[PDB]
Amino acid sequence: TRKAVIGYYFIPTNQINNYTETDTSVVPFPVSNITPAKAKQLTHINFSFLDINSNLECAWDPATNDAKARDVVNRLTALKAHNPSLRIMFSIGGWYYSNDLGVSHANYVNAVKTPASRAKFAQSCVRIMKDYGFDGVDIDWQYPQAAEVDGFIAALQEIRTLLNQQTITDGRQALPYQLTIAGAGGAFFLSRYYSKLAQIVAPLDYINLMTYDLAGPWEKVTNHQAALFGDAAGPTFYNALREANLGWSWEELTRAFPSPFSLTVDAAVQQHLMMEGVPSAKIVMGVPFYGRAFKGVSGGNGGQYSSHSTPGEDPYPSTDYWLVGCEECVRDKDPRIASYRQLEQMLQGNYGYQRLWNDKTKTPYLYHAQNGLFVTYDDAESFKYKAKYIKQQQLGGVMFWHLGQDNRNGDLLAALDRYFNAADYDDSQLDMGTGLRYTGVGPGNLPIMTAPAYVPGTTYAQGALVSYQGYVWQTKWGYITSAPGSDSAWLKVGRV
């Protein structure tokens, strides 16, 4: 089954409002950049972002010029003419609107509180989708808190129902309306709703893991923002998941959540697979189309794992644009972020950057010896490993933030498409390396194994193995006369 290639596409409100396909100083990446060939490399385009207003319904930003919005959306859905499998989805939320301190945060909390608020919010989603011509809904709330999860779950089940009804009413069985969400890609915030992952994923076609931003100015040691696998020399983190209200036993929590651990794309994907009820096919691995820059680093390991003096304030608080050769950083006023389109130009402008490669994490990085700078980003090369990882783990596909940041020839999107579908590309010999793998194992991804059926009346010694309820169980100590699961002495260690 074809791997999803989900491109979020962000156009700030004032760009909609001054939209033009002829002046990059105003709209850097207009829809015209997406040629028929590019439309064919995508399966989904997630227009970003819509919000949840004070009336607790899905709606465009208050300051949006509706005529221009519809014109831009129409330009996107017109791309469907070149690829019959393409879906233009819209995403609700995003960092700016929904974080704990976001401008619309309370609307998200309220929208999901009661059956009526949920019914009202859900219907507003379907109305917006039909009214503008979208093909599905992506919920990007970062992130409901533990108490808000049950309501959030109910709002998703409500949107699924309305959407499924709409697919029937519109004869869209050839391309059903879809529902997806963007999920945390790191243990830290994933722990808010982790215990109820199965219920959260059930109503979705995909869960887009934001497996990027794993590093940033908020961490004392510079690091790759999307390491595929871990590097023993890099930092490690407390496995917050071991504290989730899972109801598991110490042995289960320990085998499932080693701590500390390496914060990697691999860790997030495995953490999701460990949950019963979360099918690999619904998991989509996000990759970033931009890099993160740190200053005040020390040479030695090319800027990696070093202390730094990068401001963490959001937005950036200064006019000191220290990313050498980064024009894009000046107009957007932040030297800490740079689109891959710009990073590429920085590399060919003799600005003093050296491109390095970490064969453990399988990701590139820039180092500027003269000014002490370090940049972590992804490229066509790191995408090879991630694409193979996706195929190997049988994931749903890849997702990226965001289309508007690729170079003009669209090499990043092209590489992704190439690795999944080009008949002249073969990665059977691509060596995935020795970087650290997340070794956790849980209920949803136990090893297949065999054992003598459990025999009632039998006394089992320590470490004994038996089959029961379609699982293989192992005793934790001796003289076990109880049945598996029917006593704290047995550890479920395998399936079938």
Ligand X SMILES: CC(=O)N[C@@H]1[C@@H](O)[C@H](O[C@@H]2O[C@H](CO)[C@@H](O[C@@H]3O[C@H](CO)[C@@H](O[C@@H]4O[C@H](CO)[C@@H](O[C@@H]5O[C@H](CO)[C@@H](O)[C@H](O)[C@H]5NC(C)=O)[C@H](O)[C@H]4NC(C)=O)[C@H](O)[C@H]3NC(C)=O)[C@H](O)[C@H]2NC(C)=O)[C@@H](CO)O[C@H]1O
Under rule CB under 6 A, residue 4 binds ligand X: no
Under rule CB under 6 A, residue 442 binds ligand X: no
When the beta carbons of 12 and 352 are compared against ligand X, the nearer one is 12
When the beta carbons of 216 and 410 are compared against ligand X, the nearer one is 216
Q: Which of 189, 261, 316, 419 binds ligand X (CB under 6 A)?
A: 189
Residues 229-288 that bind ligand X (CB under 6 A): none
> Taking contact as CB under 6 A, which single stretch among the options 69-77, 207-215, 244-252, 436-444 is the one that binds ligand X?
207-215
CA count, 13 A, side-chain hemisphere, 441 = 11
Sheet holding 490-495, edge to edge: 465-468, 471-475, 490-495
Under rule CB under 6 A, residue 493 binds ligand X: no
Q: Which residues contact 397 (CB under 8 A, 6 or more apart)?
A: 2, 3, 4, 5, 6, 43, 206, 284, 285, 390, 420
When the beta carbons of 94 and 372 are compared against ligand X, the nearer one is 94
Rounded to the nearest 5 degrees, what angle is found at the Cα of 492, between the Cα atoms of 490 and 495?
Answer: 145
Give me the sign of the Cα torsion angle 65, 69, 70, 75.
positive
Give me the sign of the Cα torsion angle 291, 297, 299, 304.
negative
> Taking contact as CB under 6 A, which single stretch among the options 91-99, 389-397, 447-455, 458-466 is the one that binds ligand X?
91-99
Q: Which of 61, 213, 252, 328 binds ligand X (CB under 6 A)?
A: 213
> Taking contact as CB under 6 A, which single stretch among the options 81-89, 106-114, 214-222, 460-468 is the one that binds ligand X?
214-222
> Taking contact as CB under 6 A, which single stretch among the options 90-98, 108-116, 358-366, 470-478 is the one that binds ligand X?
90-98
Least distance CB 197 / ligand X (angstroms): 16
- 435 near 229, Cβ under 8 Å? yes
Which residue has the closest beta carbon to ligand X? Answer: 186
When the beta carbons of 317 and 447 are compared against ligand X, the nearer one is 317
- Cα Rg of the chain, angstroms: 24
Number of other CB atoms surrounding residue 87 within 10 Å: 22
10 Å CB burial of residue 100 (0-12, 13-18, 19+) is: exposed
Under rule CB under 6 A, residue 95 binds ligand X: yes
Distance, CA of 184 to CA of 191 (rounded, Å): 9
Binding mask 368-407 for ligand X (x = CB under 6 A): ---------------------------------x------
Distance, CA of 260 to CA of 163 (rounded, Å): 41
When the beta carbons of 267 and 480 are compared against ligand X, the nearer one is 267
Least distance CB 211 / ligand X (angstroms): 9
- Say how many residues touch ligand X, by CB under 6 A: 22
> Taking contact as CB under 6 A, which single stretch among the options 106-114, 178-186, 342-350, 470-478 is the one that binds ligand X?
178-186
When the beta carbons of 288 and 484 are compared against ligand X, the nearer one is 288
Distance, CA of 233 to CA of 302 (rounded, Å): 13
Least distance CB 281 / ligand X (angstroms): 20
Residue type, 153: I
Tokens 């960092």 sit on residue: 95
Under rule CB under 6 A, residue 14 binds ligand X: no
Binding mask 308-347 for ligand X (x = CB under 6 A): ------x----------------------x----------
Sheet holding 363-368, edge to edge: 337-339, 290-295, 373-376, 363-368, 354-358
Under rule CB under 6 A, residue 188 binds ligand X: yes
Q: Which of 57, 140, 205, 378 binds ligand X (CB under 6 A)?
A: 140
Under rule CB under 6 A, residue 214 binds ligand X: yes
Least distance CB 263 / ligand X (angstroms): 6
Number of other CB atoms surrounding residue 160 within 10 Å: 19
Residue 104 phi/psi, 5-degree rounding, is -110, 10
Least distance CB 53 / ligand X (angstroms): 16
Under rule CB under 6 A, residue 186 binds ligand X: yes
Q: Which residues contact 359 (CB under 8 A, 6 or more apart)?
A: 433, 435
Distance, CA of 144 to CA of 196 (rounded, Å): 12
Residue type, 288: P
Residues that bind ligand X (CB under 6 A): 8, 49, 94-96, 140, 142, 182, 184, 186, 188-189, 210, 213-214, 216, 218-219, 290, 314, 337, 401
